Amino acid sequence: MREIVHIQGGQCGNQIGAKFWEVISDEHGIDPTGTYHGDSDLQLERINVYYNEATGGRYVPRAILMDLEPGTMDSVRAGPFGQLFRPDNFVFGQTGAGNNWAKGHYTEGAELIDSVLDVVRKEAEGCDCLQGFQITHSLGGGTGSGMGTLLISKVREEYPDRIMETFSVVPSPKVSDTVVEPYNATLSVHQLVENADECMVIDNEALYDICFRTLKLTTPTYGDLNHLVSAAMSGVTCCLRFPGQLNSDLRKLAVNLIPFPRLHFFMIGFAPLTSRGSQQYRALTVPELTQQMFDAKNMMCAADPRHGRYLTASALFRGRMSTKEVDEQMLNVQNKNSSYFVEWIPNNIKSSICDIPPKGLKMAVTFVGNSTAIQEMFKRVAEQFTAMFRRKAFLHWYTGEGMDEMEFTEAESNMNDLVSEYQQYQDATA
Amino acid sequence: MREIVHIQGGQCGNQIGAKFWEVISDEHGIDPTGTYHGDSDLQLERINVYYNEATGGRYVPRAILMDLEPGTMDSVRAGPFGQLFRPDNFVFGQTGAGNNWAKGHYTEGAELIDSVLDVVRKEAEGCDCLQGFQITHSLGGGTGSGMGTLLISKVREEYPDRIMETFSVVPSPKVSDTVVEPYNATLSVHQLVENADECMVIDNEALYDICFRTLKLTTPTYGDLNHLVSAAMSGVTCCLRFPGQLNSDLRKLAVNLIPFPRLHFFMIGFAPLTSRGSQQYRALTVPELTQQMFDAKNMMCAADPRHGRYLTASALFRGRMSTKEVDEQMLNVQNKNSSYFVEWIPNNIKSSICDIPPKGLKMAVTFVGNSTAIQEMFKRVAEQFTAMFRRKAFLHWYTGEGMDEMEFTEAESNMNDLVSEYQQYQDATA
Amino acid sequence: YNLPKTVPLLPGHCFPDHLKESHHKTQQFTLVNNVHCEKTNYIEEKNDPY
Amino acid sequence: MREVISIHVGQGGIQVGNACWELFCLEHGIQPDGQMPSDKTIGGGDDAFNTFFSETGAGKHVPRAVFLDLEPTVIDEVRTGTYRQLFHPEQLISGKEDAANNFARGHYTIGKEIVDLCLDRIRKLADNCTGLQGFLVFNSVGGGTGSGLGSLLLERLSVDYGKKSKLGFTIYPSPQVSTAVVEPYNSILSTHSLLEHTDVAVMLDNEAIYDICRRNLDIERPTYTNLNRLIAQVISSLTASLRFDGALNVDITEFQTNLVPYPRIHFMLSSYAPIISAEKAYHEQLSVAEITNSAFEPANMMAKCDPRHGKYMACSMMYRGDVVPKDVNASIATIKTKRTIQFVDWCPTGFKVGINYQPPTVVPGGDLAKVMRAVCMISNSTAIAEVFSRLDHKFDLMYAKRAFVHWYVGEGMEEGEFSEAREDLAALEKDYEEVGIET
Amino acid sequence: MSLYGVGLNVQVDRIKTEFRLYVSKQKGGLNVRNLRRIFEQLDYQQNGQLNLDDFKAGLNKFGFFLKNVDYQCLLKYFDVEQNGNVNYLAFLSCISQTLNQRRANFVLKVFDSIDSEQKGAVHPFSLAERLEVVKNKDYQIGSKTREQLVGEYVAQFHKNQDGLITRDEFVSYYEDLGLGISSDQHFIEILQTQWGIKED
Amino acid sequence: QYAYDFNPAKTQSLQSRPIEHNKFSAWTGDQLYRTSYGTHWTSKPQEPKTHVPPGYAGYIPGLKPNNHYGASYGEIAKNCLSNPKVAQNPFKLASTGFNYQRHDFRDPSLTATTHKFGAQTLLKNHPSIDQKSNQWQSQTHDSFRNPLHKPN
Amino acid sequence: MKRVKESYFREHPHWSDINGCSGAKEFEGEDLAYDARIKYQKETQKQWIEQQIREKKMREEAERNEERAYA
Ligand SMILES: Nc1nc2c(ncn2[C@@H]2O[C@H](COP(=O)(O)OP(=O)(O)OP(=O)(O)O)[C@@H](O)[C@H]2O)c(=O)[nH]1
Ligand SMILES: Nc1nc2c(ncn2[C@@H]2O[C@H](COP(=O)(O)OP(=O)(O)O)[C@@H](O)[C@H]2O)c(=O)[nH]1
Ligand SMILES: Nc1nc2c(ncn2[C@@H]2O[C@H](COP(=O)(O)OP(=O)(O)O)[C@@H](O)[C@H]2O)c(=O)[nH]1
Ligand SMILES: [Mg+2]
């Protein structure tokens, strides 16, 4: 009931789903072969949120995998849990975007949109009561940023009411992976801010800093990194699938997080995450959970949340816990840092409680809050953009596929306007 | 309730802290592993005064050890009882102090003090009702008195009410432990007078003097000297931990020992201490306790107390003993040495009772007195400092990190100002 | 009566030991890339067919 | 021939509604399955269950309850748990989409497709009843779902039926302990819904329940489950006079004919006592003299409204236990003399005293200690301006910058509704303090 | 309290002062031996071990209350075999004095008068007659149920297999009443007042 | 007579203790047990559900996949949830996705092709033997579960 | 509702009980058991004390079993 289909694009998009599905199947006891092994009654109560049904007793994840180069989707079929996906559904091209936005957006990737939307049309109609589309992709990849962004624009116009979600990873300043990152990243958000109802940026810089400072793990790997997001991503929807004190769907979180239409970017994090050298000196109590859940070093976005003031936020407590100590701690959190919570919106914390904890732990927290500090990411990307454009370097590759520099100026103008408009409220007073 | 967090800095800060955490471990009967093996409830019902809690009933000392070099940090960990402190609590750099305040207050310590203030901030909020802070560090060390001083300034401005205590170890020129001692020590005092609520100074020379004369032992090691100081720390904070006839928390000792805010320096000591060849036939009664307590030579400050007049003093007796004989003795002392007590504060001795003696003995006491005799400790340092500044020898090191010549001139007056203002009351008459 | 079997902690009842065969120190603290990292002793299992 | 039907809307009501039935469930000798235990075979007497149940002609008693909601998660719990066989299988109306705290959503777009079923279901039960005395509505105003449908339901219930009384146990947000961020916006719009539609409304704010639980029950880790138990008791005593003997009884009708001075002001605060944990509950005398005093004690006012900041209009107190009529007279007179608790100038007599005989019952695994003397008061005081004033200020700050105003306008709610809604809240004040001026 | 050293003695030394003191003030029907027999109903196995809860309430029933700290103080030095359970046998081993020879001679001389046959064992009836005779003057020499009626005056003691009152026990059951009484003369006076026999 | 010893009670470190072993789930025996109901009547996880009335909504496992013949909603649900399957480990693959390397994922519905015909039969989802007309199942006089038995 | 019980402790008497009651010589209002009834309820209140506490204590140990088991 009120389930959501999954569409993921790009290699970074494919990988994230590669483990997000492995974890989610773990939570419901759906073995990689596809047969049931759950234990309680819950593992079969509301499983319609992500799983469909077919003859043979095996469960088919209702995912749509879209990559413009066959390498990624071919790989996903080899590793564990690489057999639950519908082989029929995969849509793949023949050339490759070559980390160029237009090539996978305007000429070819658009040319591929004929079939990919067709499968999606069938998928959405199948569900009784569709609840939204959660899209995961990378802004550092030309096709992923384009095909993902191109797909969103078509989808939104087709379902004006159904909610829309996005997981975007923006390149950090220090640890960069692409030389053309400033262009595509800046010119693609423009496509996201107008159509993307929700966004939760993830910074690859943040992960490594958390990896060495939080996990104390000697040899992290991209397999591990994909896990942190995978668990957290489940946090936003986890309470939707299982009974709890105060049910909170994806709609309600959107209800209490976005003040005005044009600010729909959030920064999130996951806790508790205790390294193996010190799990046995700490104490697992509700106050201990929150002191790590609003702290800077655990957030998923490299922007420091203390350089600005929060507008509103929601915390989705997970596990069996009683509220009275929850309310006191939260009211304690907000009322101890009046400089970091805008003064015109009282009672600026949301609360949600769900009973099932992640397998092996009792309590944890997933955070989603639109903080004005996010301007640092958008500001830094905008600046690096101005450096490259003034010399029209790297321009010919993009200008050779329809789009010219005229749209660049429009995007930068809109990009600046959102940046400034974001800070107007920070200095606003009652 | 009313817990206090111990934060120490420097090799003296660490080593002194190392034993002090060991001794307090044994009084409550806590084994190195951290599990409880106590006998009577008297050792747990108030154990929260210094300890947090965790899963498995394992206690972790709420310590914050800070240093600018690893060498001192490495040693304490490898020894017994070093497994109590948790990893995340530590904070350290990679450069070194270099016996320089300038390296300890403007350039190096600043770039790392942010974290410690972050780590220290966690303990205060977690505990129910913070009772205060205690500081252990050496004025003869660069970062020790240098960086730890910065923590004092930052902490003071963050909580206007909490009590502040500091154990100090000034370097006597007799044991010239560092030729650069005079500048830092004179520099150090300027910060300590304006901020620290209470200050407790100890002279190395006495400790060596105490070891050779009273204890009468062969080959002292820095372990032993660190031992006497450790127990002394137990005396001041003892009363709040165990039930007794009269309660005396930390703030009460201040309330009745610092006649004016400008004079908050004390001299401490421990008794009894008898040699193996001297304990055989020494009596065990109150009269012997006070006889050694007010003795001139046992005090742990190089300046001999009797050269001046006592302003105020307090006595914190421990263990069972008739309240009468403690009261009568104190009356006895305030009459047989009339010339040694100031005139305009009659009955200027404090006494207290606690019902648990340290393991192995029957009667013990910790003394704390603010005597005008401390003017010697500054005067020797004060005269010392002026001698080597008129030639500005060694001046180039401090001036290498932004310090201005005015600062040194300024520090001279305040420390000079205190010396003049301290002895004015000595000649005052009613 | 109940006599103790070893001397308890006190001012001079330790004044062992400082005259041992060899004194070696192992660096348990190392600073890399502005992140604290330390050794992993005292937590080592041995082995198993699990 | 005297029955009352319960109408529940919203998750807050569902949880509080779920718990409220067990207290009745264990109070009439009915096991969960729905029929008397097989151990007691003496035919059948009593008939006391007729007040809250209907005879099915064979065995099980079907509660005269109706549950509504727009999100099925909470409702699914009841129909799958151990209470599966009790509730009527088809009157647990369930939705398919949630309001998401959009007071407009449940009042203009989605509720229209569910308002029909609820009205059809309720009208059927009214036919079965013969002496229907009144309705009871439980809801929470901190969520749109309760605010929306509940607001719509009452508007329809005051037209079709006419002169039947109605009782409203609403739940406004706590002063500063808030779960949502948009509650102030939809909280005010809800006020106009029951301002002129509900005969009697009961203030039962949350934060007070926590206060009572901590200082009296001696629990440092309370949860929603224990919060409900106190509220269900309040329902227990109010209607307790309808299904047991008494030498001086008060029907549901005889509360809003005495506790509402004027048609406008009809909100009365509710307080309960005693609340003493078994660890010490019976280790004080528990005499009637002390029980009444705690009724007027400022700290146990189950609503977070300071009663000493206003005059007392009129109080009707229900006594259940072993009270002898002399006990009520001796204690009541003392309170009047008090100079710390005063009564308005033009209300000389302001006590309506009732006596009931059936003792309060203790649920297994509970906190309340089974005592033999308890008191329930439902009093209206001018102090209620405190809660209304606070909700007024919070509204002003946010609306100044037109924050969040978009969604309640884009769902189909005309932006103009706010202009009129705010005035009534201001209008409500000026009459609350006008009546407080002595002649 | 800080029972690291002789403290186990000091805490035990003092606590016995309070308990023995309390019985002396009562001095009446409350007898130490009652506690000796009381604990059997709590043992449930005759092993002599009882949990923490059982021991505390039983002492509460008799009418002696102590500090919380002591109860663990009692537990440690009487938890001989490290079970966490106190041994009432040892606890009853204490609070039982040896007896001063002033009483012993008064005890044994009285025993000599009772056992005129020098056999060493007392028939229950003979002790019964002397106790009742001293209380009444016209009690008459004969009755109907002298044995059963006058026996209930006795059997607070216990007999051996033969059924007579053995020398060992009879002395035992007069000292145990030596804890509730703390006056030497009045302890003596009890004997001749209850016996009409006084020689010292 | 000796020096000072550290360890009291001689508590050997967990390092040298025998071995890790299968007691991991000593907590997750009551971990999957709701508290919205629960703690009202029982304390362990709610037992498996055997009956549902109309309006239950969420995913009775057997309804949607295989089209069941017409019947009362109470009766149809009973057959699916009261039968075997929906359980038991046919292949023993663990949930954690580790038994994956043990298995092969092989299907016995193959042969060969080319040089004649390339269709191949269908997989094991195929009815047979049960071939029997509609009127066979529905109509019989009393050989069924008595509609109103309910032993007392 | 109705009124059957004059007082919580005693019911209306059987007709053979009120032999007189023609004149105000009997009133039954002095209880005459007030000492008795108060004495009875005293011990009765105790049992509910003991029962709840012992039940309450047990739930604590199981509560300690959960968190410790977590350990
Ligand atoms: N006292 C009490 N209040 C509750 C309870 N459940 C919910 N609430 C109140 O309800 C408010 C939030 O709305 P909910 O009642 O949880 O849900 P709702 O009103 O139905 O709105 P939706 O969640 O959209 O359906 C909170 O601020 C609580 O104060 C409860 O069990 N007890
Ligand atoms: N954290 C993380 N980032 C990834 C992963 N895979 C890809 N990325 C990001 O994606 C960017 C390159 O994306 P790209 O392959 O060009 O996207 P495409 O053009 O749509 O195929 C890099 O900057 C990476 O930061 C992953 O597994 N984890
Ligand atoms: N008595 C004693 N003094 C110590 C000890 N450790 C350090 N000190 C004093 O500390 C001073 C040097 O400290 P230093 O290393 O410069 O501190 P740093 O600036 O923190 O590195 C010397 O004068 C010593 O007297 C100790 O264990 N015992
Ligand atoms: Mg809801």
Q: Which residues contact E197 (CB under 8 A, 6 or more apart)?
A: E110, E113, E130, E191
The CATH number linked to D27 is 3.40.50.1440
**Chains touching D by CB (3 or more pairs below 8 Å):** A, F, G
> Is D33 a member of any domain?
yes
Contact B89, A311 (CB under 8 A): no
CA E196/CA D141 separation, integer angstroms: 90
Strand B364-371 and strand D53-55: the pairing is unpaired
What does this entry list as its resolution, in Å?
Answer: 4.1
Contact D167, D267 (CB under 8 A): no
Cross-chain Cβ contact E73/B40 below 8 Å: yes
> Is D105 a member of any domain?
yes
Experimental method: cryo-EM
CA of A323 to the centre of ligand 1 (A): 13
Selecting from C5, C13, C50 the residue whose C-beta is nearest the C-beta of F20 gives C50
Element (H, E) at B367: strand B364-371
Residue A357 neighbours by CB distance under 10 Å: 20
Of D239, D267, D295, the one marking the end of a domain is D267
Contact D108, D413 (CB under 8 A): yes
Number of H helices, E strands in chain B: 14, 10
Burial environment of residue D211 by CB neighbours within 10 A (0 to 12, 13 to 18, 19 or more): middle
- Pocket of ligand 3 from Cβ distances under 6 Å: B 10-12, 15, 67, 97, 99, 138, 140-144, 169, 171, 177-178, 204, 222, 225-226
Among candidate residues A30, A14, A8, A5, the one with its CA nearest the CA of residue A250: A5
Among candidate residues B248, B15, B240, B50, the one with its CA nearest the CA of residue B138: B15
Contact B146, B105 (CB under 8 A): yes
Q: At what angle do helices D325-337 and D288-296 cross, to 10 degrees?
A: 40
Answer whether D touches A (≥3 Cβ pairs < 8 Å): yes
- The string of DSSP letters for C1-50 reads ----SSPPS-TT-----S--S-------EEEETTEEEE--TT--------
Q: At what angle do helices E101-114 and E167-175 cross, to 10 degrees?
A: 130
Tokens coding D386: 């405190």
| Nearest atom, ligand 3, residue B10 CA | 20
Mark whether D216 and D339 lie in a shared domain: no
> Is D424 a member of any domain?
no
A144 is in an annotated binding site: yes
> Is D432 a member of any domain?
no
| Nearest atom, ligand 3, residue B225 CA | 1
CA of B146 to the centre of ligand 3 (A): 12
CA B228/CA B233 separation, integer angstroms: 9
Tokens coding A263: 């600010």
Cross-chain Cβ contact A259/D404 below 8 Å: yes
CA E149/CA E145 separation, integer angstroms: 6
Element (H, E) at B142: helix B142-158
The answer, yes or no, to whether the previous bond of F48 is cis (omega within 30 of 0) is: no
Q: Which residues contact B71 (CB under 8 A, 6 or more apart)?
A: none
Chain G residue with Cα closest to D244: G1
Strand A63-67 and strand A5-9: the pairing is parallel
CA B62/CA B233 separation, integer angstroms: 16
Strand D53-55 and strand A63-67: the pairing is unpaired
| Nearest atom, ligand 2, residue A11 CA | 21
Mark whether D131 and D26 lie in a shared domain: yes
CA of B404 to the centre of ligand 3 (A): 27
Cross-chain Cβ contact F53/D18 below 8 Å: no
**Interface list for chain G against chain D, based on CB atoms closer than 8 Å:** 1-8, 41, 45-46, 48-49, 52-53, 56, 59
- Ion ligand 4 nearby residues (CB, 5 A): D 11, 71, 145
Contact D380, D314 (CB under 8 A): yes
State phi, psi for A205 to the nearest 5 degrees: -65, -40
Among candidate residues D79, F35, F87, the one with its CA nearest the CA of residue A43: F87
Element (H, E) at A92: strand A91-92
G66 at interface of F, judged by CB pairs closer than 8 A: yes
> Is D430 a member of any domain?
no
Is residue A171 lining ligand 2, measured as CB closer than 6 Å? yes
**Distance linking the first and last C-alpha atoms of chain D:** 45
CA G65 to each of CA A385, E52, G53, G55, G58: distance values in angstroms, whole numbers, following the listed order: 60, 19, 18, 16, 11
Contact E15, E66 (CB under 8 A): yes
Among candidate residues B329, B297, B313, B328, the one with its CA nearest the CA of residue B367: B313
Mark whether D35 and D59 lie in a shared domain: yes
Q: Which residues contact D50 (CB under 8 A, 6 or more apart)?
A: D1, D3
Choose which residue among D9, D16, D98, D140 to substitute to test ligand 1 binding: the one with the highest number of ligand atoms within 8 A of its C-beta.
Answer: D140
Mark whether D276 and D262 lie in a shared domain: no
Selecting from F53, F54, F58 the residue whose C-beta is nearest the C-beta of D84 gives F53
Among 3.30.420.40, 3.40.50.720, 2.60.120.460, 3.40.50.1440, what is the CATH number of A3-256? 3.40.50.1440
Among candidate residues A254, A220, A424, the one with its CA nearest the CA of residue A342: A424
Residue A131, helix vs strand vs coil? coil
CA D249/CA F62 separation, integer angstroms: 56
Amino acid at B209: D
E5 at interface of C, judged by CB pairs closer than 8 A: yes
Length of chain G measured in residues: 71
Of D340, D363, D386, the one marking the end of a domain is D386
Selecting from B29, B32, B37 the residue whose C-beta is nearest the C-beta of F6 gives B32
Mark whether D223 and D288 lie in a shared domain: no
Provide, as residue numbers in chain G, all residues whose Cβ is less than 8 Å from the Cβ of B55: 67, 70-71
Alpha-carbon dihedral sign for residues B302, B306, B307, B313: positive
Contact A307, D358 (CB under 8 A): no
CA B220 to each of CA A223, B19, C17, C18, C22: distance values in angstroms, whole numbers, following the listed order: 57, 15, 11, 11, 20
Q: What is the DSSP letter of D77?
A: H
Cross-chain Cβ contact E72/B360 below 8 Å: no
Burial environment of residue E40 by CB neighbours within 10 A (0 to 12, 13 to 18, 19 or more): exposed
Residue D192, helix vs strand vs coil? helix
CA F80 to each of CA A128, F137, G28: distance values in angstroms, whole numbers, following the listed order: 21, 17, 70
Tokens coding A91: 């849509």
Of D230, D245, D267, the one marking the end of a domain is D267
Q: What is the DSSP letter of B215?
A: I
Burial environment of residue B200 by CB neighbours within 10 A (0 to 12, 13 to 18, 19 or more): buried
CA D268 to each of CA D259, D303, D348: distance values in angstroms, whole numbers, following the listed order: 8, 10, 18
Chain F residue with Cα closest to A244: F36
CA F71/CA A403 separation, integer angstroms: 61
C1 at interface of E, judged by CB pairs closer than 8 A: yes
Beta bridge partners of residue D418, listed in sequence order:
none
Q: Which residues contact F59 (CB under 8 A, 6 or more apart)?
A: A44, A45, A46, A47, A48, A53
Beta bridge partners of residue D248, listed in sequence order:
D355
Contact F53, D84 (CB under 8 A): yes
Q: Which residues contact D261 (CB under 8 A, 6 or more apart)?
A: D313, D314, D347, D380, D435
Tokens coding F125: 């989802």
CA dihedral E136, E138, E139, E144 (to 10 degrees): -170
Is residue A149 lining ligand 2, measured as CB closer than 6 Å? no
Among candidate residues D101, D121, D96, D110, the one with its CA nearest the CA of residue D10: D101
Cross-chain Cβ contact B40/E72 below 8 Å: yes
Mark whether D225 and D308 lie in a shared domain: no
Selecting from B40, B355, B360 the residue whose C-beta is nearest the C-beta of E3 gives B40
Tokens coding F76: 């149809």
**Locate tokens 């530590």: which residue?**
B90
Q: Which residues contact B159 (CB under 8 A, 6 or more apart)?
A: B124, B130
Radius of gyration over alpha carbons of chain F, in Å? 28
Is residue D12 lining ligand 1, measured as CB closer than 6 Å? yes
Cα distance from D2 to chain G (closest Cα, Å)? Answer: 9
Element (H, E) at E166: strand E165-166
The CATH number linked to D329 is 3.30.1330.20
Binding residues of B for Mg(2+): 69
Contact B314, B350 (CB under 8 A): yes
**Interface list for chain E against chain B, based on CB atoms closer than 8 Å:** 1-5, 68-69, 72-73, 76
Answer whether A touches E (≥3 Cβ pairs < 8 Å): no
Is residue D227 lining ligand 1, measured as CB closer than 6 Å? yes
Residue ranges of alpha helices (H) inside chain E are: 7-26, 32-38, 40-43, 52-62, 68-78, 88-93, 101-114, 124-133, 146-151, 167-175, 184-195
CA D325/CA D252 separation, integer angstroms: 22
Cross-chain Cβ contact A26/F95 below 8 Å: yes
Provide, as residue numbers in chain F, all residues whose Cβ is less than 8 Å from the Cβ of G63: none
Is the domain spanning B265-374 CATH 3.50.50.60? The answer is no
Answer whether D touches B (≥3 Cβ pairs < 8 Å): no
CA B294 to each of CA B265, B291, B305, E70: distance values in angstroms, whole numbers, following the listed order: 17, 6, 10, 36
Residue F123 neighbours by CB distance under 10 Å: 12
Burial environment of residue E199 by CB neighbours within 10 A (0 to 12, 13 to 18, 19 or more): exposed
Contact D275, D212 (CB under 8 A): yes
Choose which residue among D8, D11, D114 to substitute to test ligand 1 binding: the one with the highest number of ligand atoms within 8 A of its C-beta.
Answer: D11
B55 at interface of G, judged by CB pairs closer than 8 A: yes
Amino acid at D197: H
Beta bridge partners of residue A143, listed in sequence order:
none
Provide the domain count of chain D. 2
The answer for G 22-51 residues in CB contact with F (under 8 A) is none
Active site residue D254: yes
Contact D352, D318 (CB under 8 A): no
The answer for B 318-337 residues in CB contact with A (under 8 A) is none
Tokens coding F35: 């508290």
Tokens coding C15: 């004044």
Selecting from B73, B93, B215 the residue whose C-beta is nearest the C-beta of C12 gives B215
> Is D84 a member of any domain?
yes
Answer whether G touches C (≥3 Cβ pairs < 8 Å): no
Among candidate residues F43, F58, F66, F24, the one with its CA nearest the CA of residue A41: F58
Domain of residue D292: give its range: 268-386
Alpha-carbon dihedral sign for residues D17, D18, D21, D22: negative
Tokens coding A402: 């329809």
CA A395/CA A405 separation, integer angstroms: 8
Tokens coding D212: 């009572």
Strand A199-200 and strand A265-271: the pairing is parallel
Q: What is the DSSP letter of B51?
A: B
> Is D438 a member of any domain?
no
CA B94/CA B69 separation, integer angstroms: 6
CA of A94 to the centre of ligand 4 (A): 47
Choose which residue among A138, A151, A179, A222 to substitute to test ligand 2 binding: the one with the highest number of ligand atoms within 8 A of its C-beta.
Answer: A138
G70 at interface of F, judged by CB pairs closer than 8 A: yes
Tokens coding F46: 């709610």
Tokens coding B352: 């207290």
Residues carrying CATH 3.40.50.1440, chain A: 3-256
Mark whether D242 and D377 lie in a shared domain: no
> Is D391 a member of any domain?
no
3-state helix, strand, coil in chain D (%, to 5): 40, 15, 45
**Distance linking the first and last C-alpha atoms of chain C:** 52
CA D203/CA D198 separation, integer angstroms: 13
Residues carrying CATH 3.30.1330.20, chain A: 265-374
Amino acid at D186: N
Q: What is the DSSP letter of A44?
A: G
> Considering every ligand atom, which ligand is closest to the CA of B205?
3
Cross-chain Cβ contact F9/B31 below 8 Å: yes
CA angle F115, F118, F119 (to 5 degrees): 160
Among candidate residues B319, B317, B222, B314, the one with its CA nearest the CA of residue B268: B314
Residue B24 neighbours by CB distance under 10 Å: 21
Tokens coding D424: 């009534």
> From the centroid of its chain, how far is CA A75?
22
CA of B12 to the centre of ligand 3 (A): 4
Tokens coding E153: 């005056």
Contact A198, A136 (CB under 8 A): no
CA D401/CA D429 separation, integer angstroms: 25
Tokens coding F143: 């050989």
E109: left (phi over 0), alpha (psi -120 to 50) or beta: alpha
Element (H, E) at B92: strand B91-92
